[PDB]
Amino acid sequence: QISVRGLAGVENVTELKKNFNRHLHFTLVKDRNVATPRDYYFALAHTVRDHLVGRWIRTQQHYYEKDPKRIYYLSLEFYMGRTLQNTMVNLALENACDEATYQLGLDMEELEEIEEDAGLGNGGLGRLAACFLDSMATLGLAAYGYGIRYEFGIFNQKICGGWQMEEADDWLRYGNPWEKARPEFTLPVHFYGRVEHTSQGAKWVDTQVVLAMPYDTPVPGYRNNVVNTMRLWSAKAPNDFNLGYIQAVLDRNLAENISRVLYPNDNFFEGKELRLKQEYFVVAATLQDIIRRFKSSTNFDAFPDKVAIQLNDTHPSLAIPELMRVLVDLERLDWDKAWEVTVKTCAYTNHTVLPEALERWPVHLLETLLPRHLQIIYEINQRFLNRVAAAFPGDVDRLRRMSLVEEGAVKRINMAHLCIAGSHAVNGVARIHSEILKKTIFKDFYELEPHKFQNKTNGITPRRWLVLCNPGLAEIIAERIGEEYISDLDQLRKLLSYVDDEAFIRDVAKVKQENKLKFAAYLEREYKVHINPNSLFDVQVKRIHEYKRQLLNCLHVITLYNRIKKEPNKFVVPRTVMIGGKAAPGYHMAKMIIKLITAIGDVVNHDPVVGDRLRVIFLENYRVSLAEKVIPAADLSEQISTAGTEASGTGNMKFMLNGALTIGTMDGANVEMAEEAGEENFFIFGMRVEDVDRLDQRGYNAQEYYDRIPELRQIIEQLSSGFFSPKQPDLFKDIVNMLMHHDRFKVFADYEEYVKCQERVSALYKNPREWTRMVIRNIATSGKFSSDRTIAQYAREIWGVEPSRQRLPA
Amino acid sequence: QISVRGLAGVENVTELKKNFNRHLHFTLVKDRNVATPRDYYFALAHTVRDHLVGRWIRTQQHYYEKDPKRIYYLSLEFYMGRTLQNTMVNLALENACDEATYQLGLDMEELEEIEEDAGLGNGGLGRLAACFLDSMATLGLAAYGYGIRYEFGIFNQKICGGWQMEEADDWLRYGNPWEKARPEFTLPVHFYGRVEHTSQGAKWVDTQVVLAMPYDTPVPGYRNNVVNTMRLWSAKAPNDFNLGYIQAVLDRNLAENISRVLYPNDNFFEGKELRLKQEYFVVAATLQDIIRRFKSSTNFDAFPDKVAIQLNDTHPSLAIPELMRVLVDLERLDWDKAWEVTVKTCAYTNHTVLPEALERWPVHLLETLLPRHLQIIYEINQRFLNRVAAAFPGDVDRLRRMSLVEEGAVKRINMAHLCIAGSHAVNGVARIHSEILKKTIFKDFYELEPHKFQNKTNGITPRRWLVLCNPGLAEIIAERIGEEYISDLDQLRKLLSYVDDEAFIRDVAKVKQENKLKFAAYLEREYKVHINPNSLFDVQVKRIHEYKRQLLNCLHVITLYNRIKKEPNKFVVPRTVMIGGKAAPGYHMAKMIIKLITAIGDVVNHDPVVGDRLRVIFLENYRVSLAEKVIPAADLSEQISTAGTEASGTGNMKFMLNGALTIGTMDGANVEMAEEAGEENFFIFGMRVEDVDRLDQRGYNAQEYYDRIPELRQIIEQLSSGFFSPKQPDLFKDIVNMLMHHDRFKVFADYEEYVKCQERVSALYKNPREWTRMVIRNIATSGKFSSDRTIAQYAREIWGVEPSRQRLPA
Ligand SMILES: OC[C@H]1O[C@@H](NC(=S)N/N=C/c2ccc(Br)cc2)[C@H](O)[C@@H](O)[C@@H]1O
Ligand SMILES: OC[C@H]1O[C@@H](NC(=S)N/N=C/c2ccc(Br)cc2)[C@H](O)[C@@H](O)[C@@H]1O
Ligand SMILES: OC[C@H]1O[C@@H](NC(=S)N/N=C/c2ccc(Br)cc2)[C@H](O)[C@@H](O)[C@@H]1O
Ligand SMILES: OC[C@H]1O[C@@H](NC(=S)N/N=C/c2ccc(Br)cc2)[C@H](O)[C@@H](O)[C@@H]1O
């Protein structure tokens, strides 16, 4: 039907149809009489996956013959979403499969909805890993993603009585057609035990063993015939485990619990032993696999020439002492040589500045679980601190600030300090974030080793985040500038010469309207909720966090409601305000915020005076597949974190690429987005980082704002008095108290500017032509935010490898 | 190569080769450079399984269109062994696959060794279920096997220092190519809760729910294109289960533990809650599936015309009150009608008379776990006992003897009594066993309802137990009488006219010698143990039980050793004595017996004076795949249970079919085997049932035997003094004490006759011609012991269905 979806050739369509029937029969053991919709999905998945196989074998074979430097991306999170459409897109099979299924009497889009998200991540960090894998394959890098195959991913969110309920994400229940178990590479991982010092070095003995079994998932590049591997480890008990009899067999569950569930606590570091076990498990299995592949090329001098390990935050930081352990204890390298190898191999990416999220493991935990690693960390620390002492003689406070070991009630290891010490490169994920790292939280480290600190501004893949989710937009763009932009997103700049083109303006606006109608219909069908598709779609989707300031959004919503109620017969630009995102299960304030949003909806949506001029909807179970639907439909992207708190954001880039305008603070990548598009084409408001700093020095007094802004006072009074919870008048007392007395994120301080800026948004929307021209100016300058650009920068400036857009033979 | 293995046509071989390569590539994601032996096995399994698919779909479709009466065989055990060769045999694909793999440079027999046994049973009862499934498919019956998909089957047995060690049988670790998950038939099973009595009947409420997910395995008939289903249930937690967060997800293991492991305690009934849960789980899921299929044909009068449920022992006895529960509580049938339906639907097969194996569930367990079922059982009991009281007025002791409820310390439900009450047919498994049921343990029930009691003598499938495991024997038989005997085993009688045929005598003896050489080589290669292949292979393989009297065998072995040591330069017929079998992990005496056997081996095998004249080997990890190897190799089958204790035995029939002579007591099916072959062609010794009864009346005094048999005294003295355990002189004091003071199985009482009978065995073996002629007389009369005969009897006399040897279209 549409051009960017590929050719639907006669031969290909015929072959797809016959392979679909073959799989239905031989693979699913069904005929058309008894086949369920799920059977049809699986038949299609197997049909498509067959096309990856040759490319996958020949890609890995090529890496064996050419022996390039290998990139190992270590993450505890890979937020992949669905795989079927992505695979079809990257293989140019979409139209052919659509035609083939149509002729078989099936709707392919309906089949696509059957696939579970691989929800193996929490939010931005997990999704970044996934975009990165796609870009590495598209850029022809010999790259592997390594993580954990969680049996249960991020919980499914249900809203019951306005409250978040969690249910287990049993995503493997029907089987996963995109994975291949690799039992021949099953590896032992060691825990507990004790250290013995012999004549010939230390030995880690009396350990408990858990097996690590790998599962490989393909990562296809965009039409280049490259298929890379994501290898995820699953925990398996050894067969003699605990081996009264019945109990011993049942107790195998204990060992296998390691890979059972993704930790969803993205707000607050919890020193939980099971989490520590997960972190070591992925690291130990991965490093043995890396070393095996390196040997199948004695001389570890060449190790950093053939291996790069990227640590996605500090979660896999144990790679540093584990690499030392293998090199010193097993390979018998001297300490200094081993250390040089380690440093040159490892690089570390930081994803946050919030102190409560920093991993600081109690020493007593590491002592019991990983006694040899603790010893190694102590030795790393002593040698590192000796370097600090030599560089800054007499600066004793610097020594305690930089120590990997934190003294206090419980001694802790600061994993970020370990990562900086043991890496040749440290990067933040947006220019302002990387600057904050050099100036504030890692200032001491920057002063010691300034060459280590880099920036790598985040990006998103334009395959999933434009071609897949918004084919209508991709197509009208391709009609004018061709298809090359899909793997060279900077080419979108050519769209600037179309900002005055009446045909293009009409098409951009039409695609948005179509996306909005489609989403308005998705809401009615799957959720029985009714929305006005001519309203401005005002969207804030992201995990619920105080720093992300969904509360500020709530305050605006109530302001709009109160203004309408005050002057009911005055015209206002109709809005559909959509907020969605999951709260970490133990984060009380975040759960209260969700309840607030639904409570506002309950009042606003049923007020007859309001009509269809304002609607507040909580988007349930926000996840990658829902993002693919809502983002193309959005007019306004809410990116309103307190300046200095959102390291980068990536949702912001998704909205920019898909034709929404952004209202945002100068925080994270918003700064660079505004810089690319021009500040005139962005709705910027609020404190800058410097203003926040000024406010902290003075002391933040929320009362001052309450006293001087009558509209804000009214909202707080409504919240306190039970206007939004008639039967539980004090329901929101925690929220009011926090806002009034302990708001780390200065919600009131940005309120006035936010509301005024929102008025300017409404003003522009009244003029559809000018709204759309500004939209074109955003899309046209979104090129920098391709993860292809990000990955090319990692490759050249950190990994020491050249990307390549050249095809492998088909 | 050999005729009974089918045609290796050019077209078929070419197609097998190409489908093998297709699976290696597309299914296993490998090419020949990196493929492991296990990959080759899987490629072959997938190639063969493709051939089942059309037949499987068309068989089930046929049952839907013709709507025959369906047979549901309920068992907690299905001891299937390996599936690959069996599938090839039943599809006539063996030679073609052998040729195809040969041309690809692979040894098919080597590939076959890679397959794990499906070890979903303990011994005879589990293996009987498997033979029965094969026969039901071969006889064209619309039959389903229903059980549990245990994650862990019978433990793998390791021998360490002469002691049994158990390890988990992780048989699904690499995936099972013979199963298809059927998620659309996932069903809820209820536990705990409480009963409410409303205006309109009882209601079972506040239950905990565990999901039952079915997995289908094909059961191919012998060359008739019939493929029946074995459906095994797996336990799955519902998604809102226990839904702090992390723990709730980890706790899902609790629910799923139901299908985790097979109970291996075949010696002693343990009232363990988890076992009770397994029993209800299989019953509840199966009955819903049965009823669903029955409705997809309101009127339950026709239920017994369309449904037969066979209960394999009392393990699925809860089917009776569960059927009542569904009929009364859910369908609202009156009690008496529901009961009539239930009785006409259910039949019960008893497999033992040993009191300690009888299931007697504590009332307090059923009260908590299954409160409604207990109420139903109480009501069944009252109505049943009212019938007893009317039939035998004033016989108050009969009332307490026949009650389903046993009074005592803890009240218990006698599940065997429940099964008799609620079934239209009760059968034993060999003529003498069924007689014992009528005369002793169920005498009261027989007197009340004599029409209910039947015999169905056990059988084995001649597909697995001749064609598959002994193709050489199958072939020399087919050369003379054709191939029809394979599904009509009575035709083996035609071999009687060959007992004087010199060519046939030579061939029978040659096949045995070849089997023995092959097994002698298997022992050296996989276990590094050295045996003389010209010795008599004296084999006792079966689970270790006091009643099976492996100890009696041990006493003979020691007798032979002592006689050799006494007269070293006298000629004796060389023997290789092989004993194998697993002991239930909590059965101390059985574990002591294994240690005794190995301890005897340790002395006997290293005595220079003995030479290669006597060797004692413990066959480690006896299981179906090992039985397939050792049984064809055996000369002498040890079937030496105390008369009245082995209900049937089936190992006995396997040896008879494969050319071993039998030394045995007149117990179980041995009686009928001797009757078929003629007593002159069997080595019968020892007490008959009547002699055992006489001895019990008098009182069994082991001392008397010890005092009057000098050779027996010597052995006991050697055992006591530490001759067989020099470093732990008292190791075997438990064994001696048991033999001397509390031997329920009268080992000493059969000793003299056993030893004398064994002398007659040695005498015959000295004359190979006469040995072989007697062997021919055994094989030729083994026809009655085909499970095809057994199943045809069940079909006609219990299920009310006619078997059919007619082909379905290919
Ligand atoms: O879903 C059923 C099972 O499938 C198995 N896959 C097998 S046998 N072949 N896959 C081949 C394959 C071919 C191409 C791609 Br692109 C990916 C996999 C997986 O190993 C199991 O984990 C899984 O549960
Ligand atoms: O760079 C990608 C994105 O990274 C995000 N960091 C995230 S999701 N950390 N999660 C941390 C975490 C900690 C413990 C657990 Br258990 C789970 C998650 C930043 O907040 C975004 O600004 C940035 O765009
Ligand atoms: O082993 C990998 C997985 O395979 C799956 N089988 C699938 S997808 N098709 N089978 C088709 C089939 C075709 C013919 C026969 Br005869 C039996 C099964 C099973 O459902 C899983 O339980 C198993 O783990
Ligand atoms: O009819 C087939 C065979 O049945 C056998 N019974 C067996 S294996 N019962 N297992 C009972 C059992 C009880 C509890 C558990 Br937990 C496990 C097994 C008889 O002993 C044989 O004589 C007979 O030939």
XYZ file of C-alpha atoms in Angstrom, chain B residues 722 725-730:
7
model
C 32.155 -58.397 58.259
C 32.563 -55.142 54.816
C 36.040 -55.507 56.429
C 36.316 -51.865 57.560
C 32.721 -51.635 58.834
C 32.193 -55.148 60.284
C 28.641 -54.425 61.471
